[PDB]
């Protein structure tokens with residue numbers, strides 16, 4: 729069972745993972761494979777990795793007790809991208825676009 733607010737969160741999560749946003753959402757689908765990408769400093773800079781597959785697992789496992797905890801993980805995922813990457817990089821542009829999708833729909837949370 730989810731609260732009404734956690735159903736809204738699950739709706740947002742489904743949208744973030746949908747083909748509609750795939751052009752800019754794809755970097756956030758799975759955990760960053762730092763070694764495979766040659767980003768050998770990634771885990772020295774990012775102490776708390778997060779991605780949409782981990783958010784999905786936590787939602788499915790009823791890990792999130794409220795909307796605020798869900799939103800904290802989604803924003804942690806974007807913050808990690810903004811911390812690690814140069815601000816003019818394509819991946820940061822993709823993060824900004826997916827975060828715009830997230831923030832505008834999260835704002836429509838039922839009272």
Ligand SMILES: CNC(=O)c1cc(C(=O)N[C@H]2CC[C@H](O)CC2)c([C@@H](C)c2ccccc2)o1
Nearest residue numbers: 755756760765808809812813814817818819822
């Ligand atoms: C959550 N993903 C990331 O933070 C991330 C970082 C990266 C990545 O390569 N970062 C660069 C930034 C510039 C620096 O000079 C070298 C490392 C990528 C990959 C996969 C990506 C995604 C999109 C476009 C292009 C490269 O993904």
